[PDB]
Design a protein around this ligand. Structure first.
Ligand SMILES: [Mg+2]
Ligand SMILES: [Mg+2]
Ligand SMILES: [Mg+2]
Ligand SMILES: [Mg+2]
Ligand SMILES: [Mg+2]
Ligand SMILES: [Mg+2]
Ligand SMILES: [Mg+2]
Ligand SMILES: [Mg+2]
Ligand SMILES: [Mg+2]
Ligand SMILES: [Mg+2]
Ligand SMILES: [Mg+2]
Ligand SMILES: [Mg+2]
Ligand SMILES: [Mg+2]
Ligand SMILES: [Mg+2]
Ligand SMILES: [Mg+2]
Ligand SMILES: [Mg+2]
Ligand SMILES: [Mg+2]
Ligand SMILES: [Mg+2]
Ligand SMILES: [Mg+2]
Ligand SMILES: [Mg+2]
Ligand SMILES: [Mg+2]
Ligand SMILES: [Mg+2]
Ligand SMILES: [Mg+2]
Ligand SMILES: [Mg+2]
Ligand SMILES: [Mg+2]
Ligand SMILES: [Mg+2]
Ligand SMILES: [Mg+2]
Ligand SMILES: [Mg+2]
Ligand SMILES: [Mg+2]
Ligand SMILES: [Mg+2]
Ligand SMILES: [Mg+2]
Ligand SMILES: [Mg+2]
Ligand SMILES: [Mg+2]
Ligand SMILES: [Mg+2]
Ligand SMILES: [Mg+2]
Ligand SMILES: [Mg+2]
Ligand SMILES: [Mg+2]
Ligand SMILES: [Mg+2]
Ligand SMILES: [Mg+2]
Ligand SMILES: [Mg+2]
Ligand SMILES: [Mg+2]
Ligand SMILES: [Mg+2]
Ligand SMILES: [Mg+2]
Ligand SMILES: [Mg+2]
Ligand SMILES: [Mg+2]
Ligand SMILES: [Mg+2]
Ligand SMILES: [Mg+2]
Ligand SMILES: [Mg+2]
Ligand SMILES: [Mg+2]
Ligand SMILES: [Mg+2]
Ligand SMILES: [Mg+2]
Ligand SMILES: [Mg+2]
Ligand SMILES: [Mg+2]
Ligand SMILES: [Mg+2]
Ligand SMILES: [Mg+2]
Ligand SMILES: [Mg+2]
Ligand SMILES: [Mg+2]
Lengths: 138, 150, 128
RNA sequence: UCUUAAGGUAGCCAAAUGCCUCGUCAUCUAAUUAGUGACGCGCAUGAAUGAAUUAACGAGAUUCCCACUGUCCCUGUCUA
RNA sequence: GCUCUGAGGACUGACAGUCGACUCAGAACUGGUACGGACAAGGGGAAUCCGACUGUUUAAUUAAAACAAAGCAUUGCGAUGGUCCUCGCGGAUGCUGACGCAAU
RNA sequence: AGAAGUCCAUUGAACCUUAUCAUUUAGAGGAAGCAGAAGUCGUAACAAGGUUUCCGUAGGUGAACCUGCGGAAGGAUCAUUG
RNA sequence: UAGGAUAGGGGCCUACCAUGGUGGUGACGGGUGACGGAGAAUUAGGGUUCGAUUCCGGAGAGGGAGCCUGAGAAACGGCUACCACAUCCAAGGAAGGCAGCAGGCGCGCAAAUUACCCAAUCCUGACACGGGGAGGUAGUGACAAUAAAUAACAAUACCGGGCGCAUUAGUGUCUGGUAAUUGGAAUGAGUACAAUCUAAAUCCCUUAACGAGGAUCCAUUGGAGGGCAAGUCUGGUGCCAGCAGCCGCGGUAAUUCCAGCUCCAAUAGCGUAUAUUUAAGUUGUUGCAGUUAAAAAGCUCGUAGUUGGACCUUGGGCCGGCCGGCAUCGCGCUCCUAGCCCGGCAUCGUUACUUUGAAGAAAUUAGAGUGCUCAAAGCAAGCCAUCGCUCUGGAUACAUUAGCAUGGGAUAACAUCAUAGGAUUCCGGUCCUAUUGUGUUGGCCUUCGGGAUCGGAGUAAUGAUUAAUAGGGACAGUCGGGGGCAUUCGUAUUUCAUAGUCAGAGGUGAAAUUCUUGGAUUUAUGAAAGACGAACAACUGCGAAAGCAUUUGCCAAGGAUGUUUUCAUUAAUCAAGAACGAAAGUUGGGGGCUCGAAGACGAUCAGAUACCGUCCUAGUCUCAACCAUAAACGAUGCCGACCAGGGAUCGGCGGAUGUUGCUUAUAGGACUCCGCCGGCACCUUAUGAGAAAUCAAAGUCUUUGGGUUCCGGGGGGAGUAUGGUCGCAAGGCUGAAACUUAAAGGAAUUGA
């Protein structure tokens, strides 16, 4: 069972130190590889669109999920970003500045979409919701 | 249970409630000291002397009749064994096992039993050096141990 | 492989849970006896009787069916007379009955006596 | 499916073994029929006809690099 | 180069005396930066092929990648035998005998 | 008094060669895992899954696998005085 | 050790000398998107995470370095040099340093004005006066935080529940509301005099005249299948477009998309992303798990670490209202506190633990007082005749550890009475230091004051807990398929030899390969070889496990039982380290019956590299050395206690008469019954536990603490890559990540 002796503090403190590495949440934030992820620990990121693509939805569903390959300015990274509304891919062009956010679930793929974990949130400095809601034109 | 086995037997002695000797022990405390002293000068160890008294001379317990433990009776007379009785008997056994192996080196069970004996010898010598019943430099040497005993 | 006052107190609970009339405690000690005095003066056990054949010695306790649980806190903490309150809540059924026995330089006693005499000490067990 | 006594196994390769052949890809170069690493429908590799490796060693064959220099640009001069 | 400093010994009656051939460390000074001053005396590295290595070889055109080798394996033979020589007589292995001899 | 200069020491930037370390990054060719798809070959497993399954080791074969040796029941037997 | 230097200690530096210093209690080295603290977020408690930033400490001024002056600097709004970057040049030269304030570029998801002033707080100088991009004031500012509008009241109402008649009625009560219905009242958002404000301005707070019909002085952001509050509405689409954190929605009747309507939640705010906290008892000290869900190391030894039986009066009480102060059979006091012969004395073992205090920066936290109009705040203010002043406040607490001081002395550590070198009231000698008799200065000494040694008489109750249902060791008779060495045997099989007889035999679901008148198979006698050890043989034994069954002898070892023997805590478990470890496999020899991976054939089959059949290589067996793995399993670590009933059984011992193919007689041996101890198990049952299957140990668990070791944290990737290390090799040990995915899985139920 557990070690309980009054002078066992060194054994107990060490053991929790070893065993915390077996917790995925701990090791994820303490191993260093979050800085090797494309965003490098940022909430949003600016990018430039390389092309408009569109990706198939996973088996139970059947749709064309429309995305864009954008290239990250800070580190040259290339990622695929979902354009999340009805017909909102039209507002997106090629060689246009774009603001990329997380898509949810903290770097894990979301919904039926295979392999996409970024969403486009701004284009040309105009809110993408604002474009889908006509408030501000680009 | 056992230190070097899995047996948990409780076979042992049960000394009575009465510290004093039974009424019929009509010896003299000086006279029995001669009985202990003669047995030692005959080379017998304390554990065997107590058996002798109990079996021929009808002494149930020495601590009752004399008030003193046997080894302390010997020690006051300058007859206490140099290596304690129990340590000696282990050292005798490990010597016996090593001689048997030096003809049977594929007796892997006897090699196992050897390791247990020196583990027992060294744990006990750790104790006796601490309480100064052995010289602080006394060392159990595998080779030069058959000379010490027997 | 012995650490007594666990063997004593667990024997009483197991005897009590079954509903027996008496319990025997093979190793005894002054610490164990002083714990039974505290239990008895508070009314959770009847009298008890020491056995001297020589040895650690034996004690037989007469149980009155109204001890609910008695435990030992091995790994005996130091206990200022200030955190009495926090060990009280964690270990006792309520703020009304139950006692934590603490060994203190004015003797073994329950946490109630400890506050009055303003002494802290090292926890031994509890009963309720 | 025809056939054989058996149909070349593990391995190895344009190898001191490949005609085509200056094979194709990469590397070394300013430029490489040379070299090394790969590829393998192997004219015509292959297991004591020993197969594949291999530290140390070699007046053994080959490629490159640093240093060195009358080998050379380009000859001149001195001694016997 | 020069001028020094220290260490490392012997014998004789923790000392005193005398003697002592040799090595190594260190410093200052000095020069037209010379100093293993002539002599003597490795160029080095990254790789491929062959042969493991040492050894040997075509005297007088070939020194090797050829031969040998340790290691590995096969074969014959128990003596009235195997392998071999001899015109014959007879002989070698054999002053031997399977951990041996003989043939690859 | 005393400058320029100069001499020897000391601190010492800085530059260069070799080495080493660490972090990135290219590469013929080789080779893993994942996922997708309305593909080809079989039928290994789940029932005694049609040869009971499985573990270690070893060898062999298009593939799942097969076979030897020892082991396990997580077996298809809690059972022979019948 | 001696120097030198410094303001000064010091290998700080120098010469000579010695060989030390640190390290599993983690040295050294690496990472840090690392200045430290005061603190911050979250918080049932315990915690987890953050801390560049206004206070304190440190460090730096593009990177290094060296300096001058000065009390103070290795200063950069000082210098000198170099490195990098760059400005001017009349081309010879010259001048540099915004991590100060503002501002520009760049970089990025990511941040304000090139404003006014020394009026406040303070600082500075020769100074009452100068200066201060300290600092303050204003513009930008939905970072956070506070208070708080967007209507209130009335009657009409087609109406709507009760309540007065309750019947039959009807309306009328709180107005609940479509109501651009109607009626006047209230008011600030706004705007504007003035005054105030202020260093001067502006804003606030006061406040002349304007400032409301609901279309306006109009509130938004997310949702409406579930989780989760709110549509079985209507049009469009038709696995498209889309939504969807998750589960899911969409294939022509969509509660989920796109829209209108209506509703729901919060509300001057709300959504999204990312890190972190909670939820998470999914990191478990409090407080998790390891039979089958992830997880007991194959097994034992062992150092460190962790843990460790009992026992030594404060026991029996006088005393005054929890406690002093005390007598019992309370080791001293000269020296300080020292009562009217007297309490309450200091050194001749150390600590943790607790008690109280000190001294602890403030700001922040908690918390008292105080009506800033409330609140977040602030540290003020309140009464007087809210009249020549009165009364003031500006509390207090927590502060883990380490250090200092005080009492306690239960618990728990380390050290230590048995060579008595122990305590002890006195006794002179080995000996030195000299004080009141040296009114002065001293300086050897007679009784005399202490070292310190020291020989002897002295006194005393003269000084060693017990023997753990802890452990070791001894001894006695046993027990066992425990081990090693040598050895006796048994049939079977294969081969051989001898003899007999004559057509088949072998194998199979059925056959075929194969053997056979050179006589196969079968039968019989003998021989050789090598493996194997039937039956007996079990819900039996021994062993740490792996494992261990023919006989006998030899060698050493072991458990249990028995014991009024002995030691006396010597122990439990264990990083590092060590012994053993089935089968297979490896290197050499030996042997090579049987079986038999590989291979070769005959069948089967769609095929058959398989099952079936035939032949056979390594192997099977042994000696030497390797290897170190198994479903190495009880899928259950070891030590200890408690807990339920029973009959078997194995080993020992104890107790009973009665019986033998025994035994010179009993006694013992075989058998029957009873008891104890120790083993391998089994059965029946919960009052127990568990998800259950099940389990008398998987029990004594939210009423959670006996000790200790190993190990798990959704499924995969993967026991993979890489580095290390061990091995001849095969491989063993250690052992990720990128990425992917909503389940995988366990027990039990009904069906098929
Ligand atoms: Mg988690
Ligand atoms: Mg026991
Ligand atoms: Mg042990
Ligand atoms: Mg081939
Ligand atoms: Mg080729
Ligand atoms: Mg060339
Ligand atoms: Mg090539
Ligand atoms: Mg050929
Ligand atoms: Mg050929
Ligand atoms: Mg050939
Ligand atoms: Mg050569
Ligand atoms: Mg020299
Ligand atoms: Mg050669
Ligand atoms: Mg020649
Ligand atoms: Mg030649
Ligand atoms: Mg040759
Ligand atoms: Mg001959
Ligand atoms: Mg099948
Ligand atoms: Mg099957
Ligand atoms: Mg099965
Ligand atoms: Mg096969
Ligand atoms: Mg000095
Ligand atoms: Mg930093
Ligand atoms: Mg920073
Ligand atoms: Mg700068
Ligand atoms: Mg500075
Ligand atoms: Mg400076
Ligand atoms: Mg500046
Ligand atoms: Mg600035
Ligand atoms: Mg809406
Ligand atoms: Mg919506
Ligand atoms: Mg919902
Ligand atoms: Mg609902
Ligand atoms: Mg969403
Ligand atoms: Mg799904
Ligand atoms: Mg919905
Ligand atoms: Mg809608
Ligand atoms: Mg869990
Ligand atoms: Mg499992
Ligand atoms: Mg186990
Ligand atoms: Mg230890
Ligand atoms: Mg302390
Ligand atoms: Mg005992
Ligand atoms: Mg015995
Ligand atoms: Mg016949
Ligand atoms: Mg038996
Ligand atoms: Mg037999
Ligand atoms: Mg075959
Ligand atoms: Mg294993
Ligand atoms: Mg296991
Ligand atoms: Mg137990
Ligand atoms: Mg019996
Ligand atoms: Mg029994
Ligand atoms: Mg987890
Ligand atoms: Mg996992
Ligand atoms: Mg499983
Ligand atoms: Mg299942």
């Amino acid at each position: 069972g557990k070690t309980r002796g009054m002078g066992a503090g060194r054994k107990l403190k060490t053991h929790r130190r070893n065993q915390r590495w077996a917790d995925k949440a701990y090791k994820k934030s303490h191993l260093g590889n979050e800085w090797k992820k494309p965003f490098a620990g940022s909430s949003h990121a600016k990018g430039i669109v390389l092309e408009k693509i569109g990706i198939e939805a996973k088996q139970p569903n059947s749709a064309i999920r429309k995305c864009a390959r954008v290239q990250l300015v800070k580190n040259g990274k290339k990622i695929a970003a979902f354009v999340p509304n009805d017909g909102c891919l039209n507002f997106i062009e090629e060689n246009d500045e774009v603001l990329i956010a997380g898509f949810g679930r903290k770097g894990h793929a979301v919904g039926d979409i295979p392999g996409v974990r970024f969403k486009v949130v701004k284009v040309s400095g105009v809110s993408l919701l604002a474009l889908f809601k006509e408030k501000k034109e680009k | 249970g056992r230190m070097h086995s899995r047996g948990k037997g409780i076979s042992s002695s049960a000394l009575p409630y009465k510290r004093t000797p039974p009424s019929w022990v009509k010896t003299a405390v000086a006279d029995v000291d001669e009985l202990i002293t003669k047995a030692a000068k005959k080379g017998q160890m304390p554990s065997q002397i107590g058996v002798l008294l109990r079996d021929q001379h009808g002494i149930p317990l020495v601590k009752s009749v004399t008030g003193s433990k046997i080894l302390r009776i010997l020690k006051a007379h300058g007859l206490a064994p140099e290596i304690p009785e129990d340590l000696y008997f282990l050292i005798k056994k490990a010597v016996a096992i090593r001689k048997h192996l030096e003809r049977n080196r594929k007796d892997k069970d006897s090699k196992f039993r050897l390791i247990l004996v020196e583990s027992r010898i060294h744990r006990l010598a750790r104790y006796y050096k601490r309480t100064k019943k052995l010289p602080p430099t006394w060392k159990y040497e595998s080779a030069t141990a058959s000379t010490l005993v027997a | 492989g012995r650490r007594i006052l666990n063997d004593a107190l667990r024997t009483m609970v197991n005897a009590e849970r079954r509903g027996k009339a008496t319990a025997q405690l093979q190793p005894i000690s002054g610490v164990m006896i002083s714990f039974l005095n505290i239990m008895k003066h508070r009314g959770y056990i009847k009298n008890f009787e020491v056995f001297d054949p020589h040895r650690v010695g034996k004690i037989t306790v007469e149980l009155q069916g109204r001890i609910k649980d008695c435990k030992a806190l091995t790994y005996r903490q130091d206990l200022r007379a200030t955190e009495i309150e926090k060990y009280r809540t964690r270990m006792l059924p309520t703020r009304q009955w139950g006692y934590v026995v603490v060994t203190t330089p004015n003797g073994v006693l329950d946490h109630e006596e400890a506050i009055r005499q303003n002494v802290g000490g090292q926890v031994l067990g509890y009963f309720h």
